[PDB]
């Protein structure tokens, strides 16, 4: 099947690293394929780490259930009420721009949950992972764009990606494996 489209975020990051440099359609496909592959690798390994070592965590769920156990009936009813009012008021009362990211911290989240990588997802995991995808994207586009200017073109083509990633030891190791 098909994976998600990061194309617009690759484009924003591109416009920050090399603003007047364009990108072709195929090259954008390559970049999106990279961002996806790294998302599945980091999300996969992080998922293995999560399922392997599990830590005990108190959440509103266990507090609510404990309250329903300990308190008698009408008490427990109104206490569950006030608790839920308090947490929803705590919630309802920008995420990427908060972290200062072009990448969609909100979308990385709904994906980490969609992918069934874990039963729960923390916060700052989409911030960390979105920041990492944004950084890797930024490096690849900076090198490939420099390759676009030294080959004297106005846009990035898939060849420029091959040049930039092959002639960088670390990026070649990363995107070769």
């Amino acid at each position: 099947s098909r994976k998600e489209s990061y194309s617009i975020y690759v484009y924003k990051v591109l416009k920050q690293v090399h603003p007047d440099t364009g990108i072709s359609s195929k090259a954008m496909g390559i970049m999106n394929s990279f961002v996806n592959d790294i998302f599945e690798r980091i999300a996969g390994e992080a998922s293995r780490l999560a399922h392997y070592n599990k830590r005990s965590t108190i959440t509103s769920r266990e507090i609510q259930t404990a309250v329903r156990l300990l308190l008698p009936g009408e008490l427990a009813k109104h206490a569950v009420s006030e608790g839920t009012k308090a947490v929803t008021k705590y919630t309802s009362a920008t995420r990427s721009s908060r972290a200062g990211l072009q990448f969609p911290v909100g979308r990385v989240h709904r994906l980490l949950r969609k992918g069934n990588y874990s039963e729960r997802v923390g916060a700052g995991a989409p911030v960390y992972l979105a920041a990492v995808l944004e950084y890797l994207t930024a490096e690849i586009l900076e090198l490939a764009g420099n390759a676009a200017r030294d080959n004297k073109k106005t846009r990035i083509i898939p060849r420029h990606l091959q040049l930039a990633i092959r002639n960088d030891e670390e990026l070649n190791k990363l995107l070769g494996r």
Binding site: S7, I8, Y11, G22, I23, S24, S25, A27, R155, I157
Partner: peptide, 8 residues
Amino acid sequence: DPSWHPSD
């Protein structure tokens, strides 16, 4: 190989 541009 057309150039990429944002869309709606």
